[PDB]
Amino acid sequence: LAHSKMVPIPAGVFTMGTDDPQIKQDGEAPARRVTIDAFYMDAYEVSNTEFEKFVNSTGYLTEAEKFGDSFVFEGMLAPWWLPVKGANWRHPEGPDSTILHRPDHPVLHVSWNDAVAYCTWAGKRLPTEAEWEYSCRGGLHNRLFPWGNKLQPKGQHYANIWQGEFPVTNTGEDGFQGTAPVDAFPPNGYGLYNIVGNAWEWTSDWWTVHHSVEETLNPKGPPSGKDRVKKGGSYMCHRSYCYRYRCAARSQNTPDSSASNLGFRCAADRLP
Numbered sequence: 001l002a003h004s005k006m007v008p009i010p011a012g013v014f015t016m017g018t019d020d021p022q023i024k025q026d027g028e029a030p031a032r033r034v035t036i037d038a039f040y041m042d043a044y045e046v047s048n049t050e051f052e053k054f055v056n057s058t059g060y061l062t063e064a065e066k067f068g069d070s071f072v073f074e075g076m077l078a079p080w081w082l083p084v085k086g087a088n089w090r091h092p093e094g095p096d097s098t099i100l101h102r103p104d105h106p107v108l109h110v111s112w113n114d115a116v117a118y119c120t121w122a123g124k125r126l127p128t129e130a131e132w133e134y135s136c137r138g139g140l141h142n143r144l145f146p147w148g149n150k151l152q153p154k155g156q157h158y159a160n161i162w163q164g165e166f167p168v169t170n171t172g173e174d175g176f177q178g179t180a181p182v183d184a185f186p187p188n189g190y191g192l193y194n195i196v197g198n199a200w201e202w203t204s205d206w207w208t209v210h211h212s213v214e215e216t217l218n219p220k221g222p223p224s225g226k227d228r229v230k231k232g233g234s235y236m237c238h239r240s241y242c243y244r245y246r247c248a249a250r251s252q253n254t255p256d257s258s259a260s261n262l263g264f265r266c267a268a269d270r271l272p
């Protein structure tokens with residue numbers, strides 16, 4: 001295992017967003033050309049084991065632990081999100097759940113602040129939304145998914161999302177009802193794993209839905225806001241109610257929020 005390994009994301013210009021938005025309320029549009037300097041991205045979502053090395057070193061107590069509750073999806077105990085007392089990264093469905101059998105799965109119940117603490121501890125940082133989307137797209141232009149426009153290319157599952165009738169029945173057809181190991185599923189063109197699906201991923205940007213079509217260079221998002229941007233979708237997503245396992249998709253939460261489907265990966269200017 002090399003679950004803290006990074007890959008070099010090459011310098012380039014890409015189209016961020018889409019002029020064919022699918023969730024218009026989320027500011028997926030307009031498409032805009034964005035220039036990104038070469039940098040490094042974690043190949044994997046930060047795992048339980050890797051987060052435990054952080055906590056072992058620093059003694060860090062996560063915001064969910066201090067608050068004393070976190071949001072858990074009802075189907076694994078909106079109306080299907082329940083604030084559960086004693087749910088946190090070590091007990092992802094509440095006090096009598098454990099991570100001992102899933103050490104290689106993504107860490108969950110981590111806030112934006114928790115993520116920044118981890119990444120900075122590791123000599124890294126969160127990616128910006130633009131870096132994240134560029135990396136997600138994996139060197140392809142204007143495609144829905146890291147791998148192209150088909151959800152199941154060659155009849156193969158390429159990401160851990162939902163199959164079945166949400167929220168009642170997850171068939172587990174793709175091989176995972178909850179999370180999968182951080183190295184599950186094929187990599188995209190840049191060597192990134194589970195950049196769509198599995199856990200949602202925090203980014204550094206303040207959220208807004210108002211974007212210019214101006215061209216930009218290493219954009220950081222707006223200078224203020226109340227919610228931070230998260231990307232990529234999770235194991236809960238299904239086309240029927242969600243459609244957020246697209247690189248262009250985007251959503252938000254307050255920086256002190258935490259949930260059973262939300263995690264992160266780090267980036268860095270140079271190798272730490």
Ligand SMILES: *[C@@H]1O[C@H](CO)[C@@H](O)[C@H](O)[C@H]1NC(C)=O
Nearest residue numbers: 048049050051052053054056
């Ligand atoms: C964290 O520390 C505990 C107790 O010393 C140890 O048993 C465990 O293996 C450590 N975890 C990691 C991921 O290094």
Ligand SMILES: [Ca+2]
Nearest residue numbers: 160161174176
């Ligand atoms: Ca699944």
Ligand SMILES: [Ca+2]
Nearest residue numbers: 194195197199
């Ligand atoms: Ca993910």
